[PDB]
């Protein structure tokens, strides 16, 4: 038994491009890793389980041309409906031609190609090594929740569940709220708390996280 890409990313972030081109075996076995951080194989001679505690980042593009928002998301790529549900955050990025937008995009890429730094001077980009140090320090910390924020989270989950009671008509509503969504909200709130380096998660973190789950479906399902 030889491990694949996922196992090499244990205790790290695996990095996948062209997520559409997976075969049937990976299409079915990626569910194991996403749900339970382990790969289990019981083939001819090997009946062991591979330990892979790796978060997954994936991307995909239409094979021929551009996306068609009118058509369902599953109508342009081969990924099954079940797979897209497990992802905590799902983003649909669109490229709509427009003179104003392309002007600034070209100017920014151009300033980078000229001087290798940002055009805007409102903020100074953070140094790479310092940012990595901050990320390590944040990942060291371990926050906790409380009843006060728990009430807010449960009320928000109730509202989300009720909302999906009407959205079930659309066949592309694989983002239908489920307890997994509640756990994802908790996870994002804890992430925001970690960035603050604090130990007690406050209402601010949970409200921010709920915005990132909202803006990731609304803007990428309605458009």
């Amino acid at each position: 038994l030889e491990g694949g890409a996922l196992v090499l990313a244990d205790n790290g972030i695996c990095c996948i491009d062209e997520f559409d081109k997976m075969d049937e075996s990976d299409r079915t076995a990626i569910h194991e890793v996403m749900e339970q951080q382990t790969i289990s194989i019981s083939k001819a001679g090997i009946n062991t389980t591979l330990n892979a505690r790796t978060s997954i980042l994936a991307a995909a593009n239409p094979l021929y041309g551009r996306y068609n928002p009118r058509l369902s998301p599953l109508d342009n790529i081969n990924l099954p409906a079940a797979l897209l549900s497990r992802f905590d955050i799902l983003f649909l990025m669109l490229d709509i031609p427009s003179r104003d937008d392309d002007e600034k995009l070209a100017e920014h890429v151009t300033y980078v190609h000229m001087h290798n730094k940002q055009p805007d001077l409102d903020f100074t980009p953070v140094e790479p090594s310092k940012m990595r140090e901050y990320i390590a320090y944040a990942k060291t910390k371990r926050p906790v929740m409380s009843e006060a924020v728990n009430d807010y989270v449960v009320q928000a989950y109730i509202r989300l569940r009720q909302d999906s009671k009407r959205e079930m008509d659309s066949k592309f509503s694989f983002g239908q709220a489920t307890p997994r969504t509640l756990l994802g909200i908790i996870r994002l709130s804890q992430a925001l708390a970690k960035l603050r380096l604090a130990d007690m998660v406050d209402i601010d973190d949970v409200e921010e996280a709920l915005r990132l789950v909202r803006v990731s479906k609304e803007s990428l399902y309605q458009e």
Binding site: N47, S164, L182
Partner: protein, 194 residues
């Protein structure tokens, strides 16, 4: 490798029917016979199977019958002793209580260490024996199950096995009417009493 234990399968639907055909003999004869490349011998596979499956669609639709929603050949579903159906209905109170229960992580229960000893002792020493009262009403229960109509002899054997198993829990050497009543109660309420 699970001889005497309990095998666990996660994605039963996402399995080619070529491999599923192996389980036909395991659940029926509790043995596997291999004859190929000069090896002709049988290996005991006296193990219990615990499998799970997901609906064809994103969820379970109550309207269509069971044989359509879950996939799997209709005959295979009959082999299983019990076939449960758990669905995540949407409610203003069930969801509230579930959310309050899965968020506390951030009504006493026996310690697992003692529970394992309990089950081991029950599995080793006790050996229930059916009584006449059990048979008198087991015939009735099986014939009633078949009358309302899927229901085959495997269901009666499942009732026998479940009645014997429940008696094991209470450490009794005789299976009483109450235990078989509980077994039949469990069977009707698994598929669910529409």
């Amino acid at each position: 490798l699970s001889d005497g234990g309990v095998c666990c399968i996660d994605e039963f639907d996402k399995m080619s029917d070529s491999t599923r055909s192996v389980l036909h003999e395991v659940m029926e004869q509790q043995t596997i016979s291999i004859a190929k490349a000069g090896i002709i011998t049988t290996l005991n596979a006296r193990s219990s199977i615990l499998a799970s499956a997901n609906p064809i669609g994103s969820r379970y639709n109550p309207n269509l019958p069971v044989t359509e929603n879950i996939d799997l050949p209709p005959p295979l579903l009959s082999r299983f002793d019990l076939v449960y159906l758990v669905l995540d209905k949407v409610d203003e109170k069930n969801d509230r209580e579930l959310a309050k229960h899965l968020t506390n992580l951030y009504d006493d229960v026996l310690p697992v260490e003692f529970l394992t000893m309990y089950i081991s002792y029950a599995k080793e020493h006790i050996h229930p024996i059916i009584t006449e009262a059990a048979k008198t009403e087991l015939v009735r229960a099986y014939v009633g199950m078949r009358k309302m109509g899927t229901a085959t002899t495997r269901q009666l054997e499942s009732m026998i096995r479940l009645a014997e198993a429940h008696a094991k829990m209470k450490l009794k050497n005789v299976v009483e009417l109450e235990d078989v009543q509980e077994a039949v109660r469990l069977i009707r309420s698994a598929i669910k009493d529409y």
